[PDB]
Structures are given as C-alpha cells and as structure tokens.
Amino acid sequence: TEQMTLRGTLKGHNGWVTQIATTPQFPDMILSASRDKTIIMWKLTRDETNYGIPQRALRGHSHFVSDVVISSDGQFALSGSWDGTLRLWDLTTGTTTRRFVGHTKDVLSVAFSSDNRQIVSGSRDKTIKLWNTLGVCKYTVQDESHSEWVSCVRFSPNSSNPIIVSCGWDKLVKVWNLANCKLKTNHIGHTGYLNTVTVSPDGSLCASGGKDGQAMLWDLNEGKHLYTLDGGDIINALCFSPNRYWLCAATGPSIKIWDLEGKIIVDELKQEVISTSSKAEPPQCTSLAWSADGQTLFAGYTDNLVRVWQVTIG
Amino acid sequence: QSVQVFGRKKTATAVAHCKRGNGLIKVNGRPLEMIEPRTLQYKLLEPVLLLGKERFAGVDIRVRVKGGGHVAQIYAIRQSISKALVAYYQKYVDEASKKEIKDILIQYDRTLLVADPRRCESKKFGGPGARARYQKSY
Amino acid sequence: GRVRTKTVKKAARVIIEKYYTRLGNDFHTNKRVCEEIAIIPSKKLRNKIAGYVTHLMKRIQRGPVRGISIKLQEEERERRDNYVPEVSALDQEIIEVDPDTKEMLKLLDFGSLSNLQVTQPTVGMNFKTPRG
Amino acid sequence: DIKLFGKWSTDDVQINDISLQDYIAVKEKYAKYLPHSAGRYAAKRFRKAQCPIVERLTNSMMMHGRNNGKKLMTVRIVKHAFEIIHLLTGENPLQVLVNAIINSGPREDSTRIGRAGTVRRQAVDVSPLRRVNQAIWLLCTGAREAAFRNIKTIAECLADELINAAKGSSNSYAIKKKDELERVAKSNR
Amino acid sequence: QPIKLARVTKVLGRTGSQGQCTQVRVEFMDDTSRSIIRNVKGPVREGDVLTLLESEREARRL
Amino acid sequence: PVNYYVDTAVRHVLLRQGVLGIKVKIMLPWDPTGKIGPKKPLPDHVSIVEPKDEILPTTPISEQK
RNA sequence: ACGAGACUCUGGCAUGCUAACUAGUUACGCGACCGGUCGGCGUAACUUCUUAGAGGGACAAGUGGCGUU
Numbered sequence: 014t015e016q017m018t019l020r021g022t023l024k025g026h027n028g029w030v031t032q033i034a035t036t037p038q039f040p041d042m043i044l045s046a047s048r049d050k051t052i053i054m055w056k057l058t059r060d061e062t063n064y065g066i067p068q069r070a071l072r073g074h075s076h077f078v079s080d081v082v083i084s085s086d087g088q089f090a091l092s093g094s095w096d097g098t099l100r101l102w103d104l105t106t107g108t109t110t111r112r113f114v115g116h117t118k119d120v121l122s123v124a125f126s127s128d129n130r131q132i133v134s135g136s137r138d139k140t141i142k143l144w145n146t147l148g149v150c151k152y153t154v155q156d157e158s159h160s161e162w163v164s165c166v167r168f169s170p171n172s173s174n175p176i177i178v179s180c181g182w183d184k185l186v187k188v189w190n191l192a193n194c195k196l197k198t199n200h201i202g203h204t205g206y207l208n209t210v211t212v213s214p215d216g217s218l219c220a221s222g223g224k225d226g227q228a229m230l231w232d233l234n235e236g237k238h239l240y241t242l243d244g245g246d247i248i249n250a251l252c253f254s255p256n257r258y259w260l261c262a263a264t265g266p267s268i269k270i271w272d273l274e275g276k277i278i279v280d281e282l283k284q285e286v287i288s289t290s291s292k293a294e295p296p297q298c299t300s301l302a303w304s305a306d307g308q309t310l311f312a313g314y315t316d317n318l319v320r321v322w323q324v325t326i327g
Numbered sequence: 328q329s330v331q332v333f334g335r336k337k338t339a340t341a342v343a344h345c346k347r348g349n350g351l352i353k354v355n356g357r358p359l360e361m362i363e364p365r366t367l368q369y370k371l372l373e374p375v376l377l378l379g380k381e382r383f384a385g386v387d388i389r390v391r392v393k394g395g396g397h398v399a400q401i402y403a404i405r406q407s408i409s410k411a412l413v414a415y416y417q418k419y420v421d422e423a424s425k426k427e428i429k430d431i432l433i434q435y436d437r438t439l440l441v442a443d444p445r446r447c448e449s450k451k452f453g454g455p456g457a458r459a460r461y462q463k464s465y
Numbered sequence: 466g467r468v469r470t471k472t473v474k475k476a477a478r479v480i481i482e483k484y485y486t487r488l489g490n491d492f493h494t495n496k497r498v499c500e501e502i503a504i505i506p507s508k509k510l511r512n513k514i515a516g517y518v519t520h521l522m523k524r525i526q527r528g529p530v531r532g533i534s535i536k537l538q539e540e541e542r543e544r545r546d547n548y549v550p551e552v553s554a555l556d557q558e559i560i561e562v563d564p565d566t567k568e569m570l571k572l573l574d575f576g577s578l579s580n581l582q583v584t585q586p587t588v589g590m591n592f593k594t595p596r597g
Numbered sequence: 598d599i600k601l602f603g604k605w606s607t608d609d610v611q612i613n614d615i616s617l618q619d620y621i622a623v624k625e626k627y628a629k630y631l632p633h634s635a636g637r638y639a640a641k642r643f644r645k646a647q648c649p650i651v652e653r654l655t656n657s658m659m660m661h662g663r664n665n666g667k668k669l670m671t672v673r674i675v676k677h678a679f680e681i682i683h684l685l686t687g688e689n690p691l692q693v694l695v696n697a698i699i700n701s702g703p704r705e706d707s708t709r710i711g712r713a714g715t716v717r718r719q720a721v722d723v724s725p726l727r728r729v730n731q732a733i734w735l736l737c738t739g740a741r742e743a744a745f746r747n748i749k750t751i752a753e754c755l756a757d758e759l760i761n762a763a764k765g766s767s768n769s770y771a772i773k774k775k776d777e778l779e780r781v782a783k784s785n786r
Numbered sequence: 787q788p789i790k791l792a793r794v795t796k797v798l799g800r801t802g803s804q805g806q807c808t809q810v811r812v813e814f815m816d817d818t819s820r821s822i823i824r825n826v827k828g829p830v831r832e833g834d835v836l837t838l839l840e841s842e843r844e845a846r847r848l
Numbered sequence: 849p850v851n852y853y854v855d856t857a858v859r860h861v862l863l864r865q866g867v868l869g870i871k872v873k874i875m876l877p878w879d880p881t882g883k884i885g886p887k888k889p890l891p892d893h894v895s896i897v898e899p900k901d902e903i904l905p906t907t908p909i910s911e912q913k
Numbered sequence: 914a915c916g917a918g919a920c921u922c923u924g925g926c927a928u929g930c931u932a933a934c935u936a937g938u939u940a941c942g943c944g945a946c947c948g949g950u951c952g953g954c955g956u957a958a959c960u961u962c963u964u965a966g967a968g969g970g971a972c973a974a975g976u977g978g979c980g981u982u
Binding site for chain 7: 072073094096098112114293294315
C-alpha cells in the first residue's frame with residue numbers, strides 16, 4: 014500500500030486519549046475525550062512545532078469522558094462519561110443546556126443520529142437505551158437485552174432504515190431496527206467478549222472487534238460472517254476509510270491497514286520508541302479515525318499522545 | 328457573574344468575581360496593594376509582576392476572601408487571583424496564552440493554583456497539642 | 466507500609482483464577498469487572514483487589530506465575546511447550562565412549578556398532594578432593 | 598528577572614566551592630520577592646534541599662521563648678540587617694552570605710568510631726547538607742547571643758556576625774565554631 | 787595533606803552506636819581508579835561532592 | 849462490624865454468696881433481605897459468583913430464536 | 914479462626930448531580946467626573962464560594978533503580 018509517515022512529536026494530552034471524533038465538515042476540527050477529566054478540541058495548524066493547539070476546554074463530567082462523537086457538522090458534539098451522564102456541547106461558548114440521565118452505572122459509548130433524532134448509548138448497566146435529543150418520550154423495549162455488559166453502539170450514516178448494532182460482554186452481537194425495536198438478527202461465535210462494533214457508511218457492511226482475537230465482519234442485510242480474519246492480539250476499535258473498502262483497526266501498539274485487493278498484509282507499519290530497554294510496554298491504541306482529506310490518521314494512545322500519520326510515498 | 332474558580336489556604340477561602348474590564352484589581356473594598364501587613368505585600372504582589380501588568384489589563388476581578396488569620400487570608404487572595412486569571416483565559420480567549428501563564432505560575436510556584444491540603448490537627452486528651460503530652464514524674 | 470493482606474491477595478488470586486478472560490491490563494477495567502463479578506462491600510477493598518489483580522496480570526505478562534495456576538492458560542502453556550528440535554540431540558554420528566564402557570558394550574553383544582569412538586583414559590586417578 | 602525583595606539581584610552570586618552548591622539556592626528558579634513562603638520542604642527528603650537558601654536562613658531565625666513562630670518578624674529583621682550589611686559593605690548581600698556559609702559550613706568532625714564504639718570519637722566527613730544546617734544554626738545562635746545582654750539591638754548582631762563570617766573575623770561565632778569543629782576532627786584521629 | 791574532592795558513588799549503609807555515621811563509596815575525579823569507603827556525618831544523598839583535606843584514613847569495611 | 853453483627857447483653861445475676869456477672873455476646877448471622885441478619889456482609893468477606901459454564905463456540909453460526 | 918488489616922467517623926478534590934428570601938453569588942432608584950467604593954446600597958444571569966446528601970476519586974496505578982529477579 015501507500016507508505017505511511019509521521020508528522021513529528023507534539024504535546025496534546027497528559028492522560029489517555031480515550032476517544033476521538035473527526036467531523037466530515039472541516040479538515041482542522043477534531044474532538045478528543047481523555048482521562049484528563051475534560052474534553053479537548055484540536056485545530057490542525059500544519060506547523061512543524063505544533064499541529065493541534067487547544068483553544069477551548071470542556072469540563073462537565075465527574076468521571077472519564079468515555080465517548081465523544083459528531084454526526085456530520087462541526088457545531089455540536091455528543092459526550093458520554095463513566096457516571097452514566099449524557100451531554101451535548103455547543104462549540105460556540107462551551108456550555109450545555111440539557112442533561113440526559115438514563116443509566117445507573119457506567120456508560121461506555123453513545124450514538125448520534127445523522128438527522129439528530131436518536132440517542133443510543135452502551136452501558137454497563139445491562140440496559141440498551143433508545144432515546145432522542147429533545148427529550149420526547151418514545152416507545153422502548155427492554156426484552157431481548159444482553160445478559161452481560163453493553164459496550165459500543167453506533168449508527169449508519171445514510172438516509173435509509175435505521176440500524177443499531179449492539180455489542181456486549183456476552184460475546185453476542187445484536188441487531189436492532191428503530192421501526193420495530195426488536196431483535197432482527199443475533200450473531201454468536203466469539204471466543205471472547207466483543208469490544209467495539211462498527212458499520213460502514215455503505216449501509217451493507219459491519220464489523221466487530223474485541224478480545225476474541227478476530228476482527229471478522231458481518232453483513233447487516235441478512236446476517237452472516239463473510240470474511241475470515243484473525244489477529245495477533247486483542248482488538249479495541251474498528252472503522253472503515255470513508256473512501257475505500259479498507260478496514261482500519263489497532264492491534265495494540267501497531268495497526269492493521271489492509272490493501273483494497275483482497276485484504277492481505279503487505280507490510281505492518283510498526284511503531285516503537287527507540288530505546289536501549291525492551292522492558293517498556295508498548296502503548297495500546299484505544300481508538301483511531303481518518304481526517305476530512307482521508308490521508309491523515311489521528312489516533313489516541315496509551316502513552317497520552319496523538320500519533321498523526323500521513324502519506325509521502327517514494 | 329463570576330468565573331467560578333475560588334481559592335483556599337488553611338480555613339480561609341477567596342473567590343475572584345470576574346467581569347470584562349481594564350485590569351483594575353480590588354480586594355474587599357481595597358485594591359491589591361493597600362493590604363495592611365506591608366510585609367506580606369510582596370506575597371500579594373507575586374502574580375501581578377510574576378507575569379506582568381499587561382495580562383492584568385483586560386479583566387476586572389474582585390477578590391472576596393473569608394477566613395482566619397492574616398497570612399492565611401493571604402495565599403488565598405493571590406492564588407484566587409492567579410487561578411481566576413487562568414480560568415478566565417481558558418474559558419474565554421484561548422489556551423495557548425492560558426497554558427503559557429499556567430506554566431509560568433507553576434514553574435515559579437507549583438502551589439499557585441492548587442490548594443494547600445494541610446489543616447490543623449485535632450487534639451487528644453492527656454496532652455495540650457496534637458502530639459505533645461502532659462509531663463509526669465517517674 | 467504498602468504490603469497487601471492475604472484477604473486482598475487471596476481475593477485477587479481467586480479473581481484471576483476464575484475470571485481470567487474478562488480481566489485486562491488496565492486497573493480501572495479491573496475495578497469495574499471486580500465490582501460486577503463479586504460482592505466487595507468496600508470501595509477501598511475493591512481498589513486494593515483491583516490493584517493486586519493488575520499487578521498479577523503484569524506478572525503473567527512476564528510469563529509464569531508461581532502463586533497461581535489457570536487451566537484455561539495451562540492448555541496453551543502445554544501447546545507452546547511442544548517443542549521438537551529438527552535434529553535430535555541424541556542422534557550424533559560420533560559418540561565418544563571410554564574403553565571400559567567399550568568393554569561393557571562388547572560384553573553386551575553391541576561391540577559391532579559403528580558410531581562409537583574410543584576415548585583416551587585419564588593418566589591419573591586424582592579425582593578426590595584434598596581432605597582438610 | 599526575579600529579584601530578592603526589590604533590589605537584590607541573583608546574577609552576581611557565584612558558589613565557586615563545588616562542594617555545597619546544590620544545597621544552596623539563590624540563582625536558580627528558586628527566586629522570590631518575599632522570604633516567607635511556608636512550603637512543603639520539611640515533609641520529605643530529596644525535597645528539603647530545594648528550599649532557597651535565604652528562605653531556610655529566615656526560617657531558622659526565630660527561636661527561643663515566644664520568638665518562635667514569628668516568621669513575619671524574621672522577614673522584618675532580615676530586610677533589616679541586610680540593608681545594614683549592604684550599606685556597610687556596598688557588596689551584594691547574597692554573595693556575602695554565600696561566602697559566610699562556605700567559610701562556616703564544617704567539612705569534617707567527629708562521631709562514633711566506625712562499626713562500633715562510644716568511649717571516644719572518630720573523625721568523619723560532614724555532609725554538605727548538615728554543614729549548611731550547622732552554618733545557619735551557628736549564625737543564628739551567635740547573632741542572638743551577641744544581642745544577649747547587650748546595648749545594641751537586633752538587626753545588628755545578625756549583620757556583623759554575617760559579615761565577619763564572610764570575612765573570617767574571630768568575632769564571628771559561625772567560623773570560630775567551624776575552626777573548633779575541624780580542630781576536634783584533627784584531635785580525634 | 788593535598789586537597790582533593792570526592793564524589794559519592796554508592797550509599798553503603800549506616801554505622802555508629804546510634805547509627806549516625808554513613809558508609810559511602812567516594813571516588814576522586816582525577817583517575818577514577820580509586821573508590822574508597824568513607825564514613826560521613828549528617829544527611830547524605832547520592833551524587834554530591836565531599837571536600838577532603840584529609841584522605842590517609844579509611845572507613846571500617848569488609 | 850461489632851456494633852451490628854454482635855448483640856451484647858451484660859446482666860447481674862443473684863447468688864447466695866454474692867452477685868455474679870453474665871456477659872452474653874452473640875454474633876448475628878448474615879442473611880440478605882431477611883429478618884435474622886444485617887443486610888450487609890462482613891466488610892472483610894469477599895464473595896465471588898461462579899462464572900457460567902458456556903461452551904466456547906468453534907464456528908460462527910446464525911441463530912434464529 | 915480471633916487479633917492486625919479490612920471497618921466507621923474524620924482531613925483534604927470534584928464548577929459532575931439531587932438544591933436551598935434560617936447563605937450568598939447574580940437583580941439598581943447619589944452613577945457623588947464627562948468606566949469605577951457598597952456589609953456608605955445613594956431602600957428575575959442561580960448554587961460559585963456556605964450548607965455533609967447520593968455517587969466518584971488513590972490502587973503502589975505509570976516510569977526508573979534495587980530486590981529470591
């Protein structure tokens with residue numbers, strides 16, 4: 014594939030960069046959730062000494078901000094935390110008018126509909142929630158829920174029938190439609206609990222990655238594992254490039270960038286700090302996303318740093 | 328309207344109510360330099376020349392302080408002023424200037440915006456102080 | 466002093482032994498899973514157990530752990546341990562043997578072997594340690 | 598650009614001893630306008646030596662009777678006697694104090710004899726940290742005894758004792774007790 | 787005796803009746819081939835320099 | 849845990865030769881949502897739920913409930 | 914198994930939450946010079962200082978050195 018490259022070293026965080034969010038609106042507007050008890054913004058500046066210099070600080074929770082997301086624009090962000098609190102932030106003045114509480118335990122991830130009418134969150138409370146943005150009470154189904162934790166729930170960014178892929182610590186994948194609010198399809202076969210389930214904007218593909226050691230993908234049209242894929246370690250986050258059929262995942266310290274032909278490895282782009290000691294554990298890449306241009310990769314890491322990669326070829 | 332930042336030392340606590348202005352600083356009916364001790368005055372002046380008068384020229388902060396003792400009322404006015412300035416800059420203008428001033432204040436004094444946790448210890452019977460004991464004959 | 470008590474150590478041992486699969490390398494996830502899977506009535510006790518759980522996981526990352534044994538990983542231990550060298554260390558085309566064992570083999574009806582090579586015996590019998 | 602009080606500069610000072618320079622802090626980031634900052638220096642080791650030398654010196658000023666716990670009085674009597682030494686000498690008071698400490702911090706003196714022994718004493722090296730402690734203690738004690746039963750008041754005995762310790766005059770208690778400590782060290786070989 | 791400073795290279799331990807002396811290896815920065823045991827008084831860290839006007843004496847060791 | 853897991857009764861008993869003292873101390877058992885024990889366990893006691901015995905799947909399958 | 918520890922109350926941090934004319938921060942009729950002191954008032958930005966309610970937070974958790982490694 015295209016040869017990757019770094020863009021230097023910069024200071025952007027003192028704790029784990031838990032979540033990232035790049036909107037498809039601007040190339041220099043990124044939101045990051047960290048263990049620094051805050052939510053940070055990143056305006057990319059394309060300077061050698063500094064790339065993203067913070068301008069605004071977002072403090073509104075009591076625990077780790079578990080997941081931050083943007084739908085399509087750059088006006089509002091949706092945030093969850095470890096106290097079960099849901100929030101939305103306007104970037105105009107750094108405040109919030111409304112608070113959503115529905116979880117008595119941990120909240121891991123939250124989903125924002127492209128049309129801003131559905132808020133779906135994963136919780137350790139063992140309860141999938143189906144709520145909205147304006148606080149309008151809607152019919153909800155509590156049956157056929159997970160028997161274990163509920164980690165990550167995402168959204169399909171297209172004008173079609175809504176779909177929720179709910180993953181749990183039960184090693185199960187559950188399929189939900191907003192119209193019927195029932196379990197259309199159940200996928201089993203994981204040897205370990207599933208961490209993150211993601212969907213492509215095409216509205217026909219889905220993937221799951223956790224501690225089972227497999228980043229095997231599922232098709233949401235009917236429901237069946239289609240492509241085989243094994244890993245060297247556990248999987249924590251997945252996505253697709255929103256221009257290619259690429260599957261982007263982090264295998265801990267390194268990443269898994271496959272080719273478009275047949276998803277066969279060409280060269281693992283290993284990253285490691287040059288040191289005389291091999292006794293230092295490599296950082297684990299919790300999450301990653303593509304930029305607006307699609308050639309810049311922004312990823313959070315266990316070493317409280319942002320590794321910004323781009324293409325230079327040769 | 329305050330930046331909602333507060334500042335403490337010992338049982339004392341001070342908050343800087345904040346508004347848009349031209350850097351006029353006042354402490355409970357008095358500006359920052361007419362405070363009585365005139366030897367702790369340098370302790371009150373620490374921030375305004377630690378980072379310069381220019382940074383204290385576009386924001387009006389009134390520091391209200393309630394607490395015990397003279398010096399314990401100090402280390403609250405100054406810390407409240409510095410942390411109020413840093414919070415005002417962080418929430419209003421940007422972080423780069425805020426980060427610069429935070430680094431400057433921490434380098435000069437790491438306990439410039441963090442509170443001093445120490446408090447007076449309780450007293451246990453059979454002694455006048457926390458650790459002192461009554462004298463007895465052998 | 467920061468020495469862990471046998472209560473914290475024993476509970477963390479049982480947690481690793483029984484719920485290895487869910488447990489990870491992060492302390493906070495360990496705390497959450499320990500709260501979910503066991504009734505630990507004290508937050509401080511929860512946190513002590515989670516810290517020992519994290520340290521034990523790092524210990525397994527180093528490799529073997531002396532104080533615990535999990536069969537779910539013992540099977541893969543035996544899987545790794547099945548190491549077979551390509552050429553057996555016992556198949557040496559030339560084996561040096563002493564004249565006395567040469568005589569023993571000749572009396573054992575194995576004097577016609579071809580891999581044996583006689584060795585020069587030591588000229589002295591100075592094998593004991595000087596007494597004193 | 599930080600100056601002690603309002604006019605003492607921290608660029609004219611030089612240690613030129615190499616022995617005790619990390620336990621003396623006048624030129625580094627430890628520069629402040631007020632010799633009164635409390636701090637957490639006395640709650641852990643490897644952090645007690647980061648206190649500025651002037652801060653430690655003013656900390657050890659108050660002692661005996663009600664005089665203890667009057668750090669503000671120490672700030673006053675330290676701005677005083679420092680104006681006095683600067684007018685008497687014309688030199689920078691910080692460098693004069695550093696000279697007095699270098700001249701007064703004992704190098705070697707007696708303790709117990711190696712592995713075991715209490716009948717007599719055996720000479721050993723004095724740590725730089727303990728030697729600055731001893732120098733400050735002798736300075737303060739000599740000053741307060743010089744004030745003791747004397748017509749002259751405070752802010753004088755400090756000044757003259759410090760200036761003699763810097764110069765080596767035998768009227769200084771600090772450096773005479775220094776020479777005493779090395780004489781005991783020599784006599785206890 | 788010639789004046790020659792010594793820098794601390796290892797804190798051996800504590801000695802004395804009340805455990806106030808400190809055995810420490812000290813090296814002279816002239817040849818780095820000599821590293822003698824010295825008993826020292828007072829709070830001693832690792833890596834400072836001890837002024838030595840006298841070096842014909844050694845600390846009890848081994 | 850002594851205050852609520854222990855019931856203590858100190859009484860004076862009559863005797864011909866004097867007054868006897870009796871101290872009856874009972875450690876109350878633990879039962880949850882019950883009427884014979886405190887609703888919280890001993891803080892030094894940690895209880896672990898036995899995990900499920902689910903067979904690990906060896907091939908992904910589509911289950912229709 | 915008891916004791917130790919765990920435990921409880923306390924001392925410290927949450928601009929996260931349930932909120933308070935028996936608490937204040939915000940509401941202004943000398944604007945006393947043509948942007949300012951208030952607990953000299955010139956008589957509805959809501960919980961930030963105050964108040965202990967429920968959760969959270971710290972565990973030797975990360976790095977390095979020593980150590981049956």
